[PDB]
Ligand binder design. Structure first.
Ligand SMILES: [Cu+2]
Ligand SMILES: [Zn+2]
Ligand SMILES: [Zn+2]
Ligand SMILES: [Zn+2]
Ligand SMILES: [Zn+2]
Length: 180
């Protein structure tokens, strides 16, 4: 159980995180998140993305009933956090810091459709950033350096935390805004 945060040096909070915690600087929160807003750490779903894992249209929720609200996808739906290309630090907070296989970060294709539910077609399915967890428990807050690709405007980053001793993973989409 954990979520992408911006308490120490993280660049951008997860979508689900912003249902509970105000964004740095702007103070913005996501709304109408449903029951997951109580527990943004709980976006757990099937292992094996992208070959298996959550099916198209249920990536953002990870097929969680509590988190079904997160699958909505429009231009106006979610709080966007500024980002730039190049080195950036991603952060996780874990309420339950499970033994970890790895963390993987995926970004939307430039011309992804921000008004359709997320699907594999929307993403570059080759992670732009992979951090190994080595089947040990991480600390309860961690930071990951990632080299982020160029994009213009609104892009989504899918952060996947793969638990090392179970057939589950945690899935946190991040709504980001590049310049342009
Ligand atoms: Cu957990
Ligand atoms: Zn796995
Ligand atoms: Zn549509
Ligand atoms: Zn690529
Ligand atoms: Zn679990």
């Amino acid at each position: 159980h954990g979520y992408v945060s911006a308490v120490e040096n993280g660049v951008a909070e997860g979508r689900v995180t912003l249902c509970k915690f105000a964004a740095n600087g702007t103070g913005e929160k996501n709304t109408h998140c449903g029951a997951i807003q109580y527990e943004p750490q709980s976006v757990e779903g099937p292992d094996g993305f992208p070959v298996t894992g959550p099916r198209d249209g249920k990536i953002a929720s990870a097929e969680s009933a509590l988190a079904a609200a997160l699958d909505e996808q429009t231009a106006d739906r979610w709080v966007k956090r500024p980002i730039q290309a190049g080195p950036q630090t991603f952060e996780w907070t874990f309420t339950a810091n499970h033994v970890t296989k790895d963390w993987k970060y995926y970004i939307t294709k430039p011309n992804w459709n921000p008004n359709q539910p997320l699907s594999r077609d929307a993403f570059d399915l080759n992670p732009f950033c992979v951090v190994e967890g080595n089947m040990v428990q991480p600390p309860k807050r961690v930071s990951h350096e990632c080299i982020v690709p160029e994009r213009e405007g609104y892009q989504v980053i899918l952060a996947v935390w793969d638990v090392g001793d179970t057939a589950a993973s945690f899935y946190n989409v991040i709504d980001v805004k590049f310049d342009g």
